[PDB]
Amino acid sequence: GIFAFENEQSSTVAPAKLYKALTKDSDEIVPKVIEPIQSVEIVEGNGGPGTIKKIIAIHDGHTSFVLHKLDAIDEANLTYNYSIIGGEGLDESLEKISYESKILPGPDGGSIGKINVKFHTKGDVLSETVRDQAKFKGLGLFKAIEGYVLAHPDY
Numbered sequence: 001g002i003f004a005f006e007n008e009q010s011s012t013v014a015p016a017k018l019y020k021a022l023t024k025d026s027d028e029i030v031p032k033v034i035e036p037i038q039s040v041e042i043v044e045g046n047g048g049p050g051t052i053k054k055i056i057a058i059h060d061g062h063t064s065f066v067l068h069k070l071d072a073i074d075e076a077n078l079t080y081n082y083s084i085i086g087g088e089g090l091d092e093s094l095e096k097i098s099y100e101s102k103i104l105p106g107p108d109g110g111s112i113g114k115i116n117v118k119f120h121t122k123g124d125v126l127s128e129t130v131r132d133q134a135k136f137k138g139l140g141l142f143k144a145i146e147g148y149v150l151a152h153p154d155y
C-alpha cells in the first residue's frame, strides 16, 4: 500500500540557511540535538544521490539504526528527496518511507518547509500509531535542527 501525506511548517530562519542545516550540516547537527542518536555514517556512496547512511541510535538500552537513502537533491531550488529504507528503526510493517521536501520563502525573511511523505506499507493498512510515530520522529528532527540554528545562528 501507499499512503501519502503533506505537511507544512513555517520558520523564521531564512530559506537558504534552513536548507543548509537540514541538508549539508544535518549529519553534524543531528547527534547534537537528538540525544539518542549517536552518529551518522555513510555506508554506500560518496555523499551524492544514491548515498546510503546508517543513523545509529540507542533504543531500549541497546544500539539500533535506520538506513537513509538520498534520492535526489537540487540545491538551487532548495529541494531534497530521501527515503528511510530499512534497519530496526523502520517499522516492520513498512517497506520504506519516502520524502520529497522543499524550502520556500516565507514572510518577514523566513521560510516555509513543505514535505510530501509516502508510507509504503507491506500490507494494505497503515497503523495510526506507526504513522504518528514516524511523523513525530521526522517533525522532531526538523524542529530540533531549526531550534539549533535559532539558538546558534553563527554555528
Ligand SMILES: C/C(=C\CNc1ncnc2[nH]cnc12)CO
Pocket (backbone or CB within 6 Å): 061, 062, 063, 064, 088
Ligand atoms: C547491547 C547492545 C546491542 C545488543 N542488543 C541489541 N542490539 C540491537 N537491537 C536489539 N534489539 C534487542 N536487543 C538488541 C548495544 O549496547
Ligand SMILES: C/C(=C\CNc1ncnc2[nH]cnc12)CO
Pocket (backbone or CB within 6 Å): 007, 008, 009, 018, 019, 022, 023, 078, 079, 080, 101, 102, 103, 113, 114, 115, 138, 139, 142
Ligand atoms: C530534510 C529537509 C527538510 C525536512 N523537512 C521537513 N521535515 C519534517 N516535517 C516537515 N514539515 C514540513 N517540512 C518538513 C531538507 O530541506
Ligand SMILES: C/C(=C\CNc1ncnc2[nH]cnc12)CO
Pocket (backbone or CB within 6 Å): 005, 006, 007, 115, 117, 131, 132, 134, 135, 136, 138, 139
Ligand atoms: C497525518 C499524520 C501523520 C503523517 N504525517 C507525517 N508522517 C511522516 N513523516 C512526516 N513528517 C512530517 N509530517 C509527517 C498525523 O499524525
Ligand SMILES: C/C(=C\CNc1ncnc2[nH]cnc12)CO
Pocket (backbone or CB within 6 Å): 026, 027, 030, 040, 053, 055, 066, 068, 084, 134, 137, 138, 141
Ligand atoms: C542526518 C540524517 C538524517 C535525518 N533524517 C531522518 N532520520 C531518521 N528518521 C527520519 N524520518 C524522517 N527523517 C528522518 C542523515 O542525512
Ligand SMILES: C/C(=C\CNc1ncnc2[nH]cnc12)CO
Pocket (backbone or CB within 6 Å): 033, 034, 136, 137, 139, 140, 141, 143, 144, 147
Ligand atoms: C523530537 C524527538 C526528540 C527531540 N525533539 C526535539 N528535540 C530537541 N529539541 C527540539 N526542539 C524542538 N523539538 C525538539 C523525538 O524522536
